[PDB]
Design a protein around this ligand. Sequence first.
Ligand SMILES: [Cl-]
Ligand SMILES: [Cl-]
Ligand SMILES: [Mg+2]
Length: 748
Amino acid sequence: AMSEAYNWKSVVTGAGGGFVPGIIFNQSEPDLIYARTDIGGAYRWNQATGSWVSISDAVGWVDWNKNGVDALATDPVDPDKVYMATGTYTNSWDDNGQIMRSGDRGNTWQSTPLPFKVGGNMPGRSAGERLVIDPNKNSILFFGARSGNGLWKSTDSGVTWSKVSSFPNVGTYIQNPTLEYGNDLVGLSWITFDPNTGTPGNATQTIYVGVADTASSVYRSTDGGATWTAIPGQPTGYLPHHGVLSSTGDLYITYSNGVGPYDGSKGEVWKLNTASGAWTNISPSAGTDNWYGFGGLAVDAQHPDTVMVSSLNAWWPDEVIFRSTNGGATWSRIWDWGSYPERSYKFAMDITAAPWLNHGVTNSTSLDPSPKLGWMMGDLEIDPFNSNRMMYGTGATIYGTNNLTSWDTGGKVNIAVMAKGVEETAVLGLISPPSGTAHLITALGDVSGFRYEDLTQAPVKFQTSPSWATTTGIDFAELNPSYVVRVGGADKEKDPGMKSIGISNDGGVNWYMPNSEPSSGTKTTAGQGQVAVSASGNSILWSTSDLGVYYSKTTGNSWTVSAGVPAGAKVASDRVNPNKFYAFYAGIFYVSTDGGATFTATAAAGLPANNVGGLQPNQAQISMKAMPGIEGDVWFAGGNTVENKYGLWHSINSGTSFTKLTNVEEADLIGFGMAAPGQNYMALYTVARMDGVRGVFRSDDAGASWVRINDDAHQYAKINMAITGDPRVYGRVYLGTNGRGTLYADPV
Ligand SMILES: [Cl-]
Ligand SMILES: [Cl-]
Ligand SMILES: [Mg+2]
């Protein structure tokens, strides 16, 4: 099981590109901050570099659900210690979560299984804090769980966990109650200690818990969690999102009529004076002036009469942050209406670290700000050692400021991208062109994808004309690589004239939309699917998501149904012969020699069919590519264990027959890069299991032997997304992920 040392690095996006539901400051050590994501693990801040370091890259293929980080706690007594509650909801039986523990700030981890599921991907994932460490006796932790599992506790520093049977209310609210197998209780929403009620080494006695139950949502124990009471006088009707106890004694709570991160059309903010028992409604807006939940909540530890909250979600014209310096008695908004439609602003956005966050819309107007302040602002935090620093997560990035108190003196708060080092995108495709200025073009969920000349530079340009959220396929003409085609999902309710295909003749720098798209009767395709471009660029083959496979030899001025190939097929172009395309579906390989107009099933046998047991079409793992420079040389990776058809196959006769490589016991992806010096065949790059070892492997000898090029510290979870080499850089691999962005790596 030979390995070769490689340097693994992120292809930079600057902003991260996904949802950050939690930012967690340590309450005792200045500049110790963590960030948790829903699909891509967690991070620790580095003040010296102003950037984040992943603490999750050892998570691998089997244990991938550890990157669903539902909660995180950082120990205020021993700040080397950090813990996380991780897992996702799936359909699988026994897909339980775990509590992970680290004694070195997340450099290394140990894990304890829980007997129930954790929902790092589920609604309410930005509520918190749901995992907490007792600030007086740090061997005590509590976890507020989903699905009726209630309140759980450890008294041995997270090693073993047990249910707190006396907790009286496991939750009643369900986001989707009549939904089939989505009948799941949200559960507990947050836990907050009163640190004045313990002493060093002795358990904190007063604990507050918020529960997703609109009729009874706030509980207190005064005996360390032995017994619990619903607090008298509490408000009813809404769902608590955060509860923060200021050192003044005021417990602040944000409420919404949803749990987040999307739903929330009404909300309130309350405080409880914990000494006097009096509750006050301090909501910044009410009635028809409130059309959003309140989500994020922060108290300024250095100035604990200062509190801020965010909308979740106001949507239009933007979100709102509200700031009070008098305990909620009065609030200032971060923007106000002037003479309508104009607005006045207390902030300025700086996206120089990720200029694509303007989405290619350069003019920022009052009713259409670009960039927006944010969205999905479920978590807002003030640095407990610096009242001038705030950070918040959005659905795309982490924003923050270092001049927050300028708000109070009439200056503008400068809000900048504060996500350097974070990469959270899901990668649907990668191409590395063999000439031109770009080494890589990515196809991404949510933020479309980007073109790189320099892999270390945050993209300047968002992909527009067409503009969409998710690129599902991309290809280029091998023998005319300036010609690039991407397909995706245009949002036609927002822009009825947007197309789901974009074409470039300048290498992907600028795009245009063709005059037509595939249609059937009165139905025009919704797009998506996969695309292949002929070697010359004279034909585009689009395996649409909804209408099946179409081709165009007219640059998209018209589209014609392809004969002989089933809807949903995987498609690929020959890299030499412009008339030759390949397709694959359900264990059948197809070839066209008329530019995609007609396909024939070949005699190729033994490829996986994805049609046994319960297997669903979204489960099919298939990676099929033809080799640059050699007509009819086709590699295929994928399959599964239930069919006993999993591995890497090679054809040298245009798919007429395939031979399974006997030295690759499972494989999921294949890609090619520059031949090694002295060798005559392009290097191969695969995601595979080799003799029991899962990883990323390179072959310099056409698959006769393989060397592992990742390692146990650089695994990136379920890496079944995309891989390619670089035709101009020997040894370089580009690896897609589902939640860690794109990596590039080169031999040491
Ligand atoms: Cl958290
Ligand atoms: Cl949420
Ligand atoms: Mg937080």
